[model samples]
Target: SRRRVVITGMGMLSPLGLDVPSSWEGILAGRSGIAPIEHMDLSAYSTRFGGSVKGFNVEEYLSAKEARKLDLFIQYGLAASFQAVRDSGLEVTDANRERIGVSMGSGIGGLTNIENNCRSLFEQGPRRISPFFVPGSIINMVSGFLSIHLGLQGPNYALTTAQTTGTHSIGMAARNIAYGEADVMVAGGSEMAACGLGLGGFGAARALSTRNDEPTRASRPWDRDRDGFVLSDGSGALVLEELEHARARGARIYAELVGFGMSGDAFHMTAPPEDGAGAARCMKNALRDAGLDPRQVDYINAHGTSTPAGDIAEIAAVKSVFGEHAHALSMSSTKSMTGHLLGAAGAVEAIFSVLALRDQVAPPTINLDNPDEGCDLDLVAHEAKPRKIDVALSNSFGFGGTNGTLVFRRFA
Candidate 1:
């Protein structure tokens, strides 16, 4: 029989706050994490604002000398992993070491490393390049570093599917446990792409909001004035274990990993189909996987990235799948406050979605001062709303039209 999977623990470091509780507090309060870039010079950039993880310290999670060997993204991933492993209280011993694993990813891994190395090559030649450059910047190092850190010796995987990286990490990890390959999996995503190259690439693509004057109001999903998504950096981690294993260990299950579905638009590289047909199919597939009715889903952590076409398409998908229940569901884009964390968005928002199930409160879609056309659904805008959440879905749609949906049900 396939094993049931559940989230035993979670940890996050987002623009909103340094940990899960503080992040949730910022979300409930509708505080914006987007602001002017602090780590680098943004004067030459078209978009000067983003949701950078402020006050980060590598020594907090790694020894001072050892921290220099890894990039900022890997450090963020490790930090979140530390919190999640501690929260789950799952000690790795010889007997269970091989039964544990890790799956984590980032949308753009070690971008700063690449930028710094290239600059050094041009300025001071090959010898100036650091020996740790390759290991520090690769995407798979997130999972590799975590396995070595915790002595986990099971299946190890990493994903870099644009914005769907986080969702895919969690989804694939659950599958590993369900199929009896492992008893527990540490899965999530992280990103540290707020550096010069990171901002330059996105800015060149015109995918960022240029709201330098009003940074707080920059990421207004479904709003009439939304310019574009505000890039952010952060990490989110979760401990997923087989139901029997979690219960045997007396672990607290936050929510059951009931459903995960993925789809490709095959239409656009960067934009969702205007009709939302691809997104609708993805949601439908997730509902079918969970054997659920659309009406049973009480809340949605939308992938509304404040992009005009993207937000509208998601609404169309919601109305298409949920139909009469569209108005009843409390859908909100926490990105309105947290900005778009890119790779980490899905994982961090997953934690928020789980919190909604626990607290019976739907986080708000702040900065929705005015709604755009076809965005008139009950978006839970401006302020947090109290309600009973039986089930929640967190949506993540990334570049290349890759879409993912995860359904979490209140543990009965």
Candidate 2:
């Protein structure tokens, strides 16, 4: 028999809100977390809107010395990891310390630090850069800082696979426990790419929204006015304990992490394959891994970034995977609200998908004003829908044809 895995605890710091409750509440209210560029200046950038988290006070969670040693990705990851690990109720004493592990992922590691330090060194000189530059910017420090602070000394690792970072991280972490690599694992992704290079890179690709004046409505997924995905930042973490371990500890189970699928289109470097063949295979592989039927899935949290081809292609992939039942289930893109957190989007949205199964309401796909003919599914648009969601599916297709999909089922 396959091992049963459950998300015992969840925590996140997304553009929607600072904590899980606040973020979920924001979803319930159908609020848009997208805002004009406030984390950095965007006067010269073509696109100025993204789902940027506001009013984050890291000093409230980490000490000055502690906060100074990490990048914003590590800072965000630590903040959310602190919440998730604490909530999981795992007794991480010296006895089981070696058996526990931390698996964290960030698509762009530390874009902010790299961009800033590089610019400083080029313009001002090497002496101007701080000592924390490399440590703060590397991807592995996400695990380093968390283990250092939380007394977790087990298997600690991080993935830097662009958009697939989050999904890959969690999948690998679960496998670690399933295969007896560890008893418990802390898994998720973090990102802080709302800076100059982050925006400029996407803008150059014409992949971000230029709706400067109206930031909230800038990310109109599946809307006729859809232009590009807005870049954003944040982190999300989950406590994944072994099946028997969780049962023994009487943990509060969120949902089952049954399946994971990954693929590459082998076509374009950034553009997804036409007809979304890669996505269809990825979804099928995940469902197969879960031993689930397409009709059993009640919700689909799509990786719809509101781009013209991505939006339509993803819907096509859904129709291909779910087939005749595609119209029966509620498929929504929370990215409509969170903007595109890039690498961190999959992790945070996976958290949301699991929560949807437990809460019985799928978040809405905002600003679906003019649905295209390609996107013909029953997208839960404008408002949250009431339904008995037993199974939820989430997809995250990264740039360069890399794709990942996850399916969650209610434990009860």
Candidate 3:
């Protein structure tokens, strides 16, 4: 039989704040973390604003010598992993060291590092490139570094599925535990792609919001005025453990991860079909895996990125899967506040879903004024809502038409 998995610890670094409590506080208060891109020169880009991780000190998480050898994404990933491991209180003794592993990832591995090295190779020649460039920038390095730091000897890997990277990482980590490969796994994603090349590429694709005048209101998911998603940087990590193992250790369980489902659109590279068939199938598969009735779901952390077609399509997908329950259950996009964290978005939103189950409150989709024609769900707009949330679902749809859904139930 497959063992049950539950979330015991979570850590995050977002544009809103450095940790989970502050970020959740900002979410419930309807605060926006999106702002003008000040870290880099945005004079040449059409989109001038983004959700950049602010006031982060690398020395706090790593030594100066170690920090200098790693990329921003790795630093953020390590910090969140450290916070999660500390929160879980799982002592990595010799007995269980081999039973704990890491599964973390990033969408665009190390765009900043890659770009900087490329510039050096061109401007200052090949010898000027730092030797730590390769180890510092790869996507799997987050997992590799975490294992090396904590002495976790079990499965160590990462998934890189664009925006769905975080969701896939968590889901696969849970599978590892369920299959008895490990007793505990630290899983999530981190990203720092709000750089010159990152911005220029997304801007060239016209996938970013251009609300320079109103940065806070830029990521208005499901709103008619929303132009595109606001690119952001951050990391989110969660500690997933087997039910019996967690119980034996007397770990504080947050929520039970009941189901995970993934799908491929095979339709468009960046856009889902108008009918949202792929997304609907993905949600349905998750419900089927959990053996849940559609009506049992209380809230959804939507994959609404505020893009014109994506937002409307997600609404359609929900309606198709839930039917009448779609209107009955509350759904909101936290992206309205945190912007789109890209690779880290899924992990962060999954944490929010677990928190919603914990507190019985639905985080609001701020700046959701003048909902678009198809966005007719009871989107908890403007303000947070207190409700009976027993089951929560977090959705993540990424580029390349990849889709993932995670289902969590409040632990009784």
User: lDDT of each model, Cα atoms only?
Assistant: 0.91, 0.85, 0.92
- What are the per-residue Cα lDDT tens digits for candidate 3 across 308-361? 989988999999999979998999999999988888999999999999999899
Q: Give the TM-score (vs. native) of candidate 2.
A: 0.97
Q: For candidate 2, give the lDDT.
A: 0.85
Please identify which of the two predictions, 2 or 3, would achieve the higher TM-score against the true structure: 3
Q: Write one digit per residue (lDDT tens) for candidate 1, span 322-379.
A: 9999999999999999999899999998899999999999999998999999899889
Give per-residue CA lDDT, model 2, range 248-348, as digits (tens).
98899898898888888887877787688999999998899888898998999999888888888888788888888989999998888888888788889
lDDT measured at residue 103 in model 1 versus the true structure, 0 to 100: 91
What TM-score do all the candidates reach, one by one?
0.99, 0.97, 0.99
Q: RMSD per prediction, one decimal?
A: 0.9, 1.3, 0.7
Q: List candidate 2 segments past 4 Å from native.
A: none
Candidate number that wins on lDDT, 1 or 3: 3
TM-score of model 1 vs. true structure? 0.99
Return the lDDT, model 1, position 260: 87
